[PDB]
Design an enzyme around this catalytic site. Structure first.
Site, PDB file in Angstrom:
ATOM      1  CD1 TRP A 296      -2.858   0.933   0.088  1.00  0.00           C
ATOM      2  CD2 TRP A 296      -2.734   1.731   2.129  1.00  0.00           C
ATOM      3  NE1 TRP A 296      -3.773   1.738   0.587  1.00  0.00           N
ATOM      4  CE2 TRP A 296      -3.811   2.252   2.017  1.00  0.00           C
ATOM      5  CE3 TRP A 296      -1.954   1.964   3.598  1.00  0.00           C
ATOM      6  CZ2 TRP A 296      -4.459   3.043   2.607  1.00  0.00           C
ATOM      7  CZ3 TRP A 296      -2.862   2.897   4.219  1.00  0.00           C
ATOM      8  CH2 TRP A 296      -4.001   3.634   3.745  1.00  0.00           C
TER       9      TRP A 296
ATOM     10  CG  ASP B 133      -2.424  -2.433   6.962  1.00  0.00           C
ATOM     11  OD1 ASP B 133      -3.593  -2.424   7.425  1.00  0.00           O
ATOM     12  OD2 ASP B 133      -2.084  -1.882   5.909  1.00  0.00           O
TER      13      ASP B 133
ATOM     14  CB  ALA C   7      -7.253  -2.621   5.819  1.00  0.00           C
TER      15      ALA C   7
ATOM     16  CE  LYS D  78     -10.096  -0.176   2.693  1.00  0.00           C
ATOM     17  NZ  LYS D  78      -8.872  -0.241   2.965  1.00  0.00           N
TER      18      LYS D  78
HETATM   19  C1  LIG Z   1      -8.184   0.536   4.000  1.00  0.00           C
HETATM   20  C2  LIG Z   1      -6.780   0.355   4.237  1.00  0.00           C
HETATM   21  C3  LIG Z   1      -6.267   1.081   5.394  1.00  0.00           C
HETATM   22  C4  LIG Z   1      -7.212   1.848   6.387  1.00  0.00           C
HETATM   23  O1  LIG Z   1      -7.750   3.093   5.702  1.00  0.00           O
HETATM   24  P1  LIG Z   1      -8.611   4.017   6.722  1.00  0.00           P
HETATM   25  O2  LIG Z   1      -9.735   4.469   5.739  1.00  0.00           O
HETATM   26  O3  LIG Z   1      -7.742   4.865   7.351  1.00  0.00           O
HETATM   27  O4  LIG Z   1      -9.371   2.931   7.755  1.00  0.00           O
HETATM   28  C5  LIG Z   1      -5.023   0.651   5.657  1.00  0.00           C
HETATM   29  N1  LIG Z   1      -4.386  -0.119   5.185  1.00  0.00           N
HETATM   30  C6  LIG Z   1      -4.652  -0.744   3.878  1.00  0.00           C
HETATM   31  C7  LIG Z   1      -3.723  -1.825   3.178  1.00  0.00           C
HETATM   32  C8  LIG Z   1      -6.030  -0.533   3.473  1.00  0.00           C
HETATM   33  O5  LIG Z   1      -6.204  -1.113   2.540  1.00  0.00           O
HETATM   34  N1  LIG Z   2      -5.536   7.111   2.405  1.00  0.00           N
HETATM   35  C1  LIG Z   2      -6.258   6.164   1.605  1.00  0.00           C
HETATM   36  C2  LIG Z   2      -6.124   5.797   0.291  1.00  0.00           C
HETATM   37  C3  LIG Z   2      -7.187   4.790  -0.195  1.00  0.00           C
HETATM   38  C4  LIG Z   2      -7.838   4.147   0.734  1.00  0.00           C
HETATM   39  C5  LIG Z   2      -8.701   3.002   0.064  1.00  0.00           C
HETATM   40  C6  LIG Z   2      -7.977   1.486  -0.223  1.00  0.00           C
HETATM   41  C7  LIG Z   2      -7.200   1.686  -1.523  1.00  0.00           C
HETATM   42  O1  LIG Z   2      -7.483   2.271  -2.601  1.00  0.00           O
HETATM   43  O2  LIG Z   2      -6.034   1.365  -1.358  1.00  0.00           O
HETATM   44  C8  LIG Z   2      -7.807   4.253   2.014  1.00  0.00           C
HETATM   45  C9  LIG Z   2      -6.729   5.000   2.320  1.00  0.00           C
END
Ligand SMILES: *Cc1c(COP(=O)(O)O)cnc(C)c1O
Ligand SMILES: Nc1ccc(CCC(=O)O)cc1
Ligand SMILES: *Cc1c(COP(=O)(O)O)cnc(C)c1O
Lengths: 394, 388
Positions: free
Chosen positions: B121, B202, B204, B237
């Site tokens: 990510w 992590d 999520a 999510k």
């Molecule tokens: C969604 C996601 C998060 C968390 O996003 P938040 O909207 O701040 O809860 C963190 N890490 C990954 C890999 C994700 O896909």
């Molecule tokens: N900063 C942020 C950006 C995107 C997402 C959604 C999950 C993604 O697209 O990797 C969550 C947080």
């Protein structure tokens, strides 16, 4: 690894709460509370606020990720509430934050990004949380005189002389209104002079506006902020909706960066949005939406202002009573400052010993710096406080 | 002063969103058949209940509410939750949890390095860079087989040291979709145990892979082996409450003494950043989790979502197969989660987006939930025609 962790000091507030709870006295009074409380010792959810949540619950179709810097409806509504018609959006950057504290934290990170050699000036005294954040960030903090322990008013000459030492680029933190913890505030004339000093020094003013509507009124309370915003080209404002909207736990705040020109506004907005994403991505939606709903919806807005005014007026009446009773018992107008102070807080000017004497002998609890929450008083408790203050020799 | 502000790099994933027969397969949000991200039944019910029972909005817990903390810990660790050695901090989303996770770790070890998967990510690296933390990478994705390069991964992890931190995706790896099996997890645990490297998990997408419990199995394995573990969880999510900003950080310690230290440093961390954490999202979550009736319906709906997405992966994989005879696209049905990387080159990626209207992340990461019966073959054609 985590065993290397240095022990961090507790909130203290809890310890104060525990101190009160153990007391087996029936007539024990708590003036240390930091939030508003009505006649029944409750912190109610405002009518307009409850209506907004009811409306949102019926209108929201999704909860997908929204604006990174907050929603436009909220940014707009807030800047208008604070700046009024003097809002020049072309040069104003707005960032939704996690409460007013979040706004303050973000304002310090922003300024440091723009100027690494940043030095911050804080009033004497100020919200302890200010120093906490600054020390944590490792920023050099400097103090400027403010509270006159003798008159319980503002030592303006001392403040001006101290602010004179500020260099170009330094940050000077001012409470827009209802100074926490003192309750002593500057007059619009004193604001005018402060501005001239900030122009001369070239120091960036950071205004902490957390009690707009609790002093003399919504507009009146924004007067100082609005004067600074028109005289000084760059101004940073940290707004809080916690108390004036009664949504403490929702964590809704707002950072407004007033800029000299549009180019700098885009530079600031970008850096602000960036700051949010590097900390928690998107800002809390719920409390912000409640606020934008209340301000844009005519009916609700009207009912909100009306309720805030009832709260404000009530606290003011409590101040007059306390001052009156204190006058009658003292045979002097020595404590008249209580009727002049604005905000829900007031520093009595009692030393720690007197504060402890009041507790032990009268069962009245307050912050160790003699700060009291006027909202914790009433027709039944005021007489006791009046007596206690006198008997301890304040 | 503010005129000195330098321009910063934007979120490319979100930038794509702004740039958007338009077919968005970018941002990681769940979408239904009609291109909408609904609110979950249990969530809506929870909010109605809340609006009726809450009588005040005064300040609450700095580390979050006990209810939220306990519910979350049970959700993540199951019966492996040792409260006496577990510290919990409510945060602003899973992202805020990661940030706090790094802050806490850096406090305890100013010379810490962080190992991240290749790829991972994007927000992982940006935050670490912002803080100025040295980043190392471990081989994870296998370019050809589209699976996990397990041997390269173990090799790189072996190079970690005491004090170093290794970031693992508990389940559903963003952005690849390639995931470790339980047997692989046990092997990773042995490496970590011998190196003394603190793992940051992590979490999520718990519930989007194989199921609520199966998706936490890997995290529960590491937790039962490693005395000290950090888990940054997101409710965005799996509860569909993205904009509410709710998640939490779990600090697993070896003894009660360290637990008190961590909990204190964690609370202090919130106090110095934004004071108290947002309440609305955390409240919804705990209400759902502590109300048998609401919980059952939540799991049912999350189950429905998870099943549907697998249906799509299978359908998509099939279309590609029956559109070239090329079994080389089978990895699609093998990947688990909401994402999958096509492996198409950057030029191929930008090619199709500007004309086909299919907007996917530059590295060919597609949000499987964006697809559907009538949009699948259109995507399939594009892939086939552009190769890869
Ligand atoms: C969604 C996601 C998060 C968390 O996003 P938040 O909207 O701040 O809860 C963190 N890490 C990954 C890999 C994700 O896909
Ligand atoms: N900063 C942020 C950006 C995107 C997402 C959604 C999950 C993604 O697209 O990797 C969550 C947080
Ligand atoms: C209350 C308060 C704030 C803001 O608190 P938040 O709950 O974070 O909105 C900021 N400054 C002062 C002086 C305050 O009293």
């Amino acid at each position: 690894m985590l065993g290397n962790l240095k022990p961090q000091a507790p909130d203290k507030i809890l310890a104060l709460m525990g101190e009160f709870r153990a007391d087996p006295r029936q007539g024990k009074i708590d003036l240390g509370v930091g939030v508003y409380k009505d006649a029944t010792g409750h912190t109610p959810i405002m009518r307009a606020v409850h209506a907004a949540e009811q409306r949102m619950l019926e209108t929201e179709t999704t909860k997908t990720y929204a604006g990174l810097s907050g929603e436009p409806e909220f940014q707009k509504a807030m800047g208008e509430l604070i700046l009024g018609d003097g809002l020049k959006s072309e040069t104003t950057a707005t960032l939704a934050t996690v409460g007013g504290t979040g706004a303050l934290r973000q304002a310090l990170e922003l300024a440091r990004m723009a100027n690494p050699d940043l030095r911050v000036f804080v009033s004497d005294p100020t919200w302890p949380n200010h120093v906490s954040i600054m020390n944590f960030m490792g920023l050099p903090v400097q103090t400027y005189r403010y509270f006159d322990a003798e008159t319980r008013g503002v030592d303006f000459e001392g403040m001006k002389a101290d602010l004179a030492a500020a260099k170009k680029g330094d940050m000077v933190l001012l409470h827009g209104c209802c100074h926490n913890p003192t309750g002593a505030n500057l007059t619009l004339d004193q604001w005018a002079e402060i501005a001239s000093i900030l122009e001369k020094t070239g120091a960036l003013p950071l205004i902490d506006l957390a009690y707009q509507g609790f002093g003399d009124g919504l507009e009146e309370d924004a007067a100082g902020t609005r004067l600074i915003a028109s005289r000084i080209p760059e101004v940073l404002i940290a707004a809080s909706c916690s108390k004036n909207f009664g949504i403490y736990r929702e964590r809704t705040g707002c950072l407004l960066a007033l800029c000299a020109d549009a180019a700098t506004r885009e530079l600031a907005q970008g850096a602000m949005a960036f700051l949010n994403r590097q900390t928690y991505s998107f800002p809390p939606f719920h409390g912000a939406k409640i606020v934008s709903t209340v301000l844009t919806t005519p009916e609700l807005r009207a009912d909100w202002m009306a309720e805030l005014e009832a709260v404000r007026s009530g606290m003011l009446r409590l101040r007059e009573q306390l001052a009156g009773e204190l006058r009658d018992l003292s045979g002097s107008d020595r404590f008249g400052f209580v009727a002049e102070h604005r905000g829900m807080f007031s520093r009595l000017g009692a030393t720690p010993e007197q504060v402890k004497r009041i507790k032990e002998e009268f069962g009245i609890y307050m912050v160790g710096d003699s700060r009291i929450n006027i909202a914790g008083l009433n027709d039944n408790t005021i007489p006791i406080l009046a007596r206690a203050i006198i008997e301890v020799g304040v």
